[PDB]
Amino acid sequence: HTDLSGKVFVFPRESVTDHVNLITPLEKPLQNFTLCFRAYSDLSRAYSLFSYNTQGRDNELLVYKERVGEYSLYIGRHKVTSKVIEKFPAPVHICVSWESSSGIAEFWINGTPLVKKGLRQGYFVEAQPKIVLGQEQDSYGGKFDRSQSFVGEIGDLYMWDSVLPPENILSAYQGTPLPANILDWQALNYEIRGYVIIKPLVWV
Amino acid sequence: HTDLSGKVFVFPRESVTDHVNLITPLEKPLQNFTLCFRAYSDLSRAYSLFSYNTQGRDNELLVYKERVGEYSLYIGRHKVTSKVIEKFPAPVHICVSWESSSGIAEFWINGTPLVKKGLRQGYFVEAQPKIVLGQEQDSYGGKFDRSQSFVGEIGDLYMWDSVLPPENILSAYQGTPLPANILDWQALNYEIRGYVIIKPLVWV
Amino acid sequence: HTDLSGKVFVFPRESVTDHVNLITPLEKPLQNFTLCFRAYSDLSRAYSLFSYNTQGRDNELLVYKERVGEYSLYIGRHKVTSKVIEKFPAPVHICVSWESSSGIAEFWINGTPLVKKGLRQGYFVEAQPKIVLGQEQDSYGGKFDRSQSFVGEIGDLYMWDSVLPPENILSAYQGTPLPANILDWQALNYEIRGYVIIKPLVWV
Amino acid sequence: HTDLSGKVFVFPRESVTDHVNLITPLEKPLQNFTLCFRAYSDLSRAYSLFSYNTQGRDNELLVYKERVGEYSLYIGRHKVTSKVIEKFPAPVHICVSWESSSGIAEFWINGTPLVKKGLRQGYFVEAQPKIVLGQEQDSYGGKFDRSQSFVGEIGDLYMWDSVLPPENILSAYQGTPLPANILDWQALNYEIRGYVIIKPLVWV
Amino acid sequence: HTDLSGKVFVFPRESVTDHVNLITPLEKPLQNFTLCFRAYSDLSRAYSLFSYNTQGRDNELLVYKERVGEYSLYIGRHKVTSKVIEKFPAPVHICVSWESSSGIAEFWINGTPLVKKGLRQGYFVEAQPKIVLGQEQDSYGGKFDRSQSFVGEIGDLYMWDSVLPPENILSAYQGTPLPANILDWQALNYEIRGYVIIKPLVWV
Ligand SMILES: *[C@@H]1O[C@H](CO)[C@@H](O[C@@H]2O[C@H](CO)[C@@H](O[C@@H]3O[C@H](CO[C@H]4O[C@H](CO)[C@@H](O)[C@H](O)[C@@H]4O[C@@H]4O[C@H](CO)[C@@H](O[C@H]5O[C@H](CO[C@]6(C(=O)O)C[C@H](O)[C@@H](NC(C)=O)[C@H]([C@H](O)[C@H](O)CO)O6)[C@H](O)[C@H](O)[C@H]5O)[C@H](O)[C@H]4NC(C)=O)[C@@H](O)[C@H](O[C@H]4O[C@H](CO)[C@@H](O)[C@H](O)[C@@H]4O[C@@H]4O[C@H](CO)[C@@H](O[C@@H]5O[C@H](CO[C@]6(C(=O)O)C[C@H](O)[C@@H](NC(C)=O)[C@H]([C@H](O)[C@H](O)CO)O6)[C@H](O)[C@H](O)[C@H]5O)[C@H](O)[C@H]4NC(C)=O)[C@@H]3O)[C@H](O)[C@H]2NC(C)=O)[C@H](O)[C@H]1NC(C)=O
Ligand SMILES: *[C@@H]1O[C@H](CO)[C@@H](O[C@@H]2O[C@H](CO)[C@@H](O)[C@H](O)[C@H]2NC(C)=O)[C@H](O)[C@H]1NC(C)=O
Ligand SMILES: O=C(O)[C@H]1CCCN1C(=O)CCCCC(=O)N1CCC[C@@H]1C(=O)O
Ligand SMILES: O=C(O)[C@H]1CCCN1C(=O)CCCCC(=O)N1CCC[C@@H]1C(=O)O
Ligand SMILES: O=C(O)[C@H]1CCCN1C(=O)CCCCC(=O)N1CCC[C@@H]1C(=O)O
Ligand SMILES: O=C(O)[C@H]1CCCN1C(=O)CCCCC(=O)N1CCC[C@@H]1C(=O)O
Ligand SMILES: O=C(O)[C@H]1CCCN1C(=O)CCCCC(=O)N1CCC[C@@H]1C(=O)O
Ligand SMILES: *[C@@H]1O[C@H](CO)[C@@H](O)[C@H](O)[C@H]1NC(C)=O
Ligand SMILES: *[C@@H]1O[C@H](CO)[C@@H](O)[C@H](O)[C@H]1NC(C)=O
Ligand SMILES: *[C@@H]1O[C@H](CO)[C@@H](O)[C@H](O)[C@H]1NC(C)=O
């Protein structure tokens, strides 16, 4: 694994091929999770931030930016959407959690909680995923779409198999995240495919 | 009866069936009242915040958000509306009072008094209500309308059979409400129907 | 008379009949005057703030809000209009003075002087007026127009038979007006006609 | 001469006749100058601020406001224009300088330098002007145009036969102008024609 | 060489001829560079800020302002574009760096980093350039276009044959740049062609 503290992936151009694969040994279906990361893009079209597909299942867990001020989460191909006041262009810190028992999904944008939504109560997110940054998967690992590609910078990505309490979400926003057991930016296993460059983070 | 201090009802999806019934023993018609609560929604269409119907009488006491910055109160099916500068989306704290003797209705939004309006001077709000959060009633307890449903979070709801002076309204807004004899968040008798989840309040 | 310190007139609904008559001991034509008051309304259409008519003479002295940010003064049926940056809805403190010798009219909005205009140099405003709040007169005392009615709250009204220097205007704005010899809120003679309610001032 | 310290000319109405003539025994052609003054108008159409014509020469030196945020200088009938962020309506302090040697024209608006422009390098502004406030001259002293008339207040007008450095512009802006040898508000020779009233300056 | 500390080039008018040539002894192809300068213009159409062409190669290194809030860099006739929130008109400090090994291009606008883009990975910028301010070259030293001309002021220009770290970019922004080996405002070799005037910098 590699410690990417203080660094970002730069997806420096639009394409249907540039991407990063994130590797996790996740074998157990997820009942709960929290996912946090920081991103900086000047795209105004929609784009995928985090794409997690499993065999036979598109949009099994997907974080997708619809337009300025509007974020969607998909769980098992069902979607919820939440709104927020934001500037454009601007760096953003995004957390999202989901809890099967209640179905509640919660976005936090720059440490501010969005209105809670709910979906897929009782569902388990399937395991053995392919996880992709920079492109949105329609297949198990592929079938990308140029108009959903992420162009810009991503970093500080963590994913936990629990629902973090607010204090721990704020800690992540402030730059001291709890160590994470699904994905952890400070101990990350990844594969760059195509034109993706690792650079220091200069915009926090 | 349940103490919901520090908690909210989450109506996590749009529907024509998800709702909470609030039970009060109120039997004497009301000359005066004050109603306070906090809400957080990213709907921009109109929606009902607090729906109180009596037998044979639609919109007997209704707090209805027309659009961003515009709030209506119905008394006995007659309406007044007042405007305020506000951000969107954003949590809101709302108090509203009405006094039969003068007919005066006063909204307070995030501690700001709106322009006073007046209606139903001399009227008495009927008692033995059905009170619903999450949907707007057109019947005694039912006949909901998807396009009036409330999607989002509501908490800290109190209702008194008198007009609170401004200092007591600010106390509610600050988080130190007087005890309340019609509805009280710290001793609430409620019935969840459909998809409504109780969660901690994280947005005040 | 009546001491309305700390209180406002509330015109709680649109109508063509609700109004207040103000009674002045004014037997002499006016060469100079200053008029100050506070108002709070969420109307965006035009409306009359202060209507003073004499026999055979419509708009003999009239303060009329044309639209957000635009105020007009009529003297002997002639009009001037001045603009200002303001928020909507918002309480406002308005002073207006006029003097025959120069014809100069000056509005002050929330203690800010508007651009001076001029009209009716050499003219004397006629005596023996009917003075009305809540409606715009077209006759001596009447002939109202619903689309010119004032809905909202008015308080702290004073009128002097001289042109106040700026430091006295600012004293009025801050809540310490000099004693006033035409109309005085602390010693006011008035009649309520229709639906007008007196309430405490809560927005200053 | 007259000392107008603390006072303004008020042009209280739109007309094609109201104006002030400024008198200066300017007998030698001008190679360099700076002109400063304060103005307050809520016109949104174009208008002349300072009109200097010589025999057979229209727009020999003219300061003209095109629209909110846009100011023009004419030298010998040729024009430059520069833009600025400004509020409307609002008082403004305006300085403009021009230098034959380089042709450079500087506007300063509320103490802020606009982008430099250039025109008429090597030219001499003709002597023996008629100088008018309130109207734009097309002839030697006349041929006004109602739609270019200045309605509002003008004060603190100074004109120097040199290009003032920045600190001298700050000095004028803050109400402490350097002594001036072409026109000086504290020793001004002027002629009022029509409806122009001298009043105290209350908006600084 | 000339020390232009505290001075700017003023391009006082639109034209297809006014320009400055910048002379550098650059003989080896450039792998990496940083370019910083300050500019002030009230043009809203597109314009060239810095035009570097080599024999037979248009837009070999070009910094081009597309519209308010949008900056482009060309390397070997390929383009990237980044967006920023900015006021108009307003002075600006611009740095841009590019590195062949990664292809990464980074704009800094008033010390704020824009989203990184990438182009021309592995390419070397050709040497023996003609470098022009005030006009956009389509040939080696010429073939200008009036609608791409720069009207306004430019100063404090430095170019280095390395990618400056962030703290050094802030140094340049604040007025204490590192000495620079390709172009240096304190030791600049330049030629004025047409109407370009050197004046003190008054807008920092
Ligand atoms: C909801 O809410 C509501 C509201 O809030 C409520 O209600 C309320 O309530 C409350 C409580 O209850 C109340 O209070 C009260 O008050 C009162 C007053 O009133 C008033 O005010 C108020 C205020 O707010 C109000 O509200 C009311 O309403 C009123 O007001 C008014 O109204 C009216 C109507 O009616 C109106 O009308 C008028 O006016 C009009 C108009 O005007 C005008 C105009 O505008 O325009 C003006 C102007 O200037 C003019 N101008 C010229 C130029 O002129 C004009 C003209 O004129 C025309 O226009 C033409 O041109 O005009 C007209 O004017 C007409 O005409 C008139 O009429 C009016 O306006 C109004 N005003 C105002 C100001 O606004 C009071 O009074 C009361 O009192 C009390 O107080 C306290 C508190 O502070 C209490 O607590 C208590 O009660 C008290 O006390 C007392 O004392 C007394 C005395 O001092 C007494 O008496 C005594 O007694 C004694 C003893 O006894 C004996 C005998 O008998 O003798 C002894 C022996 O020994 C023994 N024996 C043995 C063997 O032992 C015996 C035995 O015991 C016995 O008998 C028994 O059996 O005893 C002796 O007698 C001695 O002598 C005496 O003195 C008493 O008793 C006591 N009491 C008690 C109980 O204690 C109170 O305060 C209120 O009122 C109400 N309100 C209503 C509305 O309702 C409710 O409640 C709620 N709900 C629920 C359910 O909760
Ligand atoms: C341009 O920058 C590149 C990248 O920083 C420089 O290449 C590096 O050179 C150093 C030592 O000279 C090595 O440690 C790196 O591994 C090199 N990186 C790569 C990708 O080649 C390069 O030297 C710079 N060029 C010039 C002319 O200074
Ligand atoms: O791409 C996805 O998997 C989902 C998740 C993000 C948004 N999205 C969709 O909008 C579903 C469809 C994406 C592709 C698309 O826009 N179209 C339009 C017609 C053909 C094709 C399709 O739906 O299959
Ligand atoms: O729903 C209510 O009881 C009141 C209170 C909130 C707003 N409202 C209304 O707008 C009244 C009518 C709502 C339903 C509606 O829009 N229509 C349109 C035609 C049929 C139906 C109706 O009025 O019955
Ligand atoms: O009402 C007044 O006395 C004055 C003062 C306020 C504006 N106004 C006007 O006259 C403006 C026009 C308002 C509408 C109106 O009164 N109309 C429109 C046509 C018939 C009737 C009229 O002018 O008599
Ligand atoms: O009035 C001036 O001397 C100059 C200076 C300010 C603007 N202007 C212009 O000439 C602009 C055009 C204004 C309108 C005008 O004067 N017109 C319009 C056509 C006939 C007449 C003319 O140019 O002579
Ligand atoms: O001028 C350049 O070299 C490049 C760099 C800056 C922007 N630009 C262009 O937009 C290329 C086109 C410039 C000239 C132009 O707009 N046209 C339009 C048709 C003919 C002519 C051309 O492309 O040759
Ligand atoms: C999911 O998180 C919540 C929080 O307590 C709870 O429903 C459950 O225990 C968690 N599930 C698992 C399997 O860890
Ligand atoms: C009005 O003010 C003028 C100008 O100062 C003054 O001459 C006159 O006395 C005033 N009128 C009255 C009635 O006092
Ligand atoms: C105008 O300024 C120029 C350039 O600074 C100077 O040389 C000239 O003497 C000035 N003209 C006069 C008449 O003062």
Short mmCIF file of C-alpha atoms in Angstrom, two decimals, chain E residues 98-195:
data_model
loop_
_atom_site.label_atom_id
_atom_site.label_comp_id
_atom_site.label_asym_id
_atom_site.label_seq_id
_atom_site.Cartn_x
_atom_site.Cartn_y
_atom_site.Cartn_z
CA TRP E 98 3.68 23.80 -17.05
CA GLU E 99 5.82 20.65 -16.74
CA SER E 100 6.58 18.39 -19.74
CA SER E 101 7.13 15.21 -17.73
CA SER E 102 3.55 15.14 -16.40
CA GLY E 103 1.95 17.56 -18.85
CA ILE E 104 0.43 19.36 -15.87
CA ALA E 105 -0.54 23.03 -16.24
CA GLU E 106 -1.47 25.09 -13.18
CA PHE E 107 -2.93 28.60 -13.08
CA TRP E 108 -2.82 30.69 -9.90
CA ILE E 109 -5.12 33.72 -9.87
CA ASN E 110 -4.49 36.21 -7.04
CA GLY E 111 -2.62 33.46 -5.16
CA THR E 112 -5.51 30.98 -5.52
CA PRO E 113 -4.83 27.72 -7.38
CA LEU E 114 -7.16 26.74 -10.19
CA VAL E 115 -8.00 23.12 -11.02
CA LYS E 116 -4.98 21.50 -12.72
CA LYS E 117 -5.22 20.45 -16.35
CA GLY E 118 -2.80 18.55 -18.56
CA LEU E 119 -1.50 18.65 -22.11
CA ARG E 120 1.52 17.91 -24.23
CA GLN E 121 3.09 15.34 -21.89
CA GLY E 122 6.63 14.71 -23.12
CA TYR E 123 6.68 17.76 -25.39
CA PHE E 124 9.32 20.52 -25.25
CA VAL E 125 8.41 24.13 -25.91
CA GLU E 126 10.52 25.39 -28.80
CA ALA E 127 13.22 28.04 -28.26
CA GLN E 128 14.20 31.19 -30.21
CA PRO E 129 10.74 32.69 -29.67
CA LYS E 130 9.25 36.06 -30.54
CA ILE E 131 7.44 37.13 -27.35
CA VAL E 132 4.77 39.84 -27.62
CA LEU E 133 2.63 41.77 -25.20
CA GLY E 134 -0.38 43.76 -26.44
CA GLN E 135 -1.19 41.61 -29.48
CA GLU E 136 -1.71 37.92 -30.26
CA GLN E 137 0.77 36.66 -32.89
CA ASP E 138 -0.27 34.27 -35.64
CA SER E 139 3.18 34.44 -37.29
CA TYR E 140 6.76 34.70 -36.07
CA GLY E 141 6.51 38.22 -34.66
CA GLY E 142 3.31 39.35 -36.41
CA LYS E 143 -0.07 38.73 -38.06
CA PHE E 144 -2.04 40.37 -35.28
CA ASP E 145 -5.82 40.48 -34.78
CA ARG E 146 -7.57 43.57 -33.37
CA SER E 147 -10.20 41.49 -31.57
CA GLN E 148 -7.45 39.71 -29.61
CA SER E 149 -5.46 42.83 -28.68
CA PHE E 150 -4.82 43.69 -25.04
CA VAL E 151 -5.96 47.11 -23.89
CA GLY E 152 -4.91 48.04 -20.36
CA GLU E 153 -1.90 47.69 -18.09
CA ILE E 154 0.69 44.92 -17.50
CA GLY E 155 3.53 44.82 -15.00
CA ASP E 156 5.68 42.72 -12.69
CA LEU E 157 6.36 40.03 -15.30
CA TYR E 158 8.78 37.21 -14.51
CA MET E 159 9.46 33.90 -16.23
CA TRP E 160 11.50 31.01 -14.80
CA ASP E 161 12.69 27.76 -16.42
CA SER E 162 11.28 25.71 -13.50
CA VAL E 163 7.94 25.00 -11.78
CA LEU E 164 7.84 27.34 -8.79
CA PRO E 165 6.57 25.88 -5.56
CA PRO E 166 3.38 27.43 -4.08
CA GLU E 167 5.17 29.53 -1.45
CA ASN E 168 7.24 31.12 -4.24
CA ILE E 169 4.11 31.89 -6.24
CA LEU E 170 2.65 33.65 -3.19
CA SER E 171 5.97 35.50 -2.93
CA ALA E 172 5.53 36.79 -6.45
CA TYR E 173 1.90 37.69 -5.73
CA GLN E 174 2.94 39.68 -2.64
CA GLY E 175 5.68 41.59 -4.47
CA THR E 176 8.85 39.72 -3.57
CA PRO E 177 9.50 37.37 -6.51
CA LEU E 178 12.60 35.21 -6.78
CA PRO E 179 15.01 36.37 -9.45
CA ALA E 180 14.01 34.88 -12.80
CA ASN E 181 16.20 33.47 -15.57
CA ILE E 182 14.05 33.74 -18.72
CA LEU E 183 12.31 37.12 -18.25
CA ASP E 184 12.80 39.51 -15.32
CA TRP E 185 10.92 42.83 -14.85
CA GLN E 186 13.90 44.29 -12.94
CA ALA E 187 16.26 43.49 -15.85
CA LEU E 188 14.07 43.48 -18.93
CA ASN E 189 15.03 43.79 -22.54
CA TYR E 190 12.06 45.11 -24.50
CA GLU E 191 11.01 47.11 -27.58
CA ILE E 192 7.98 49.41 -27.77
CA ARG E 193 6.22 49.48 -31.10
CA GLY E 194 3.43 52.01 -31.58
CA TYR E 195 1.38 53.53 -28.79
#
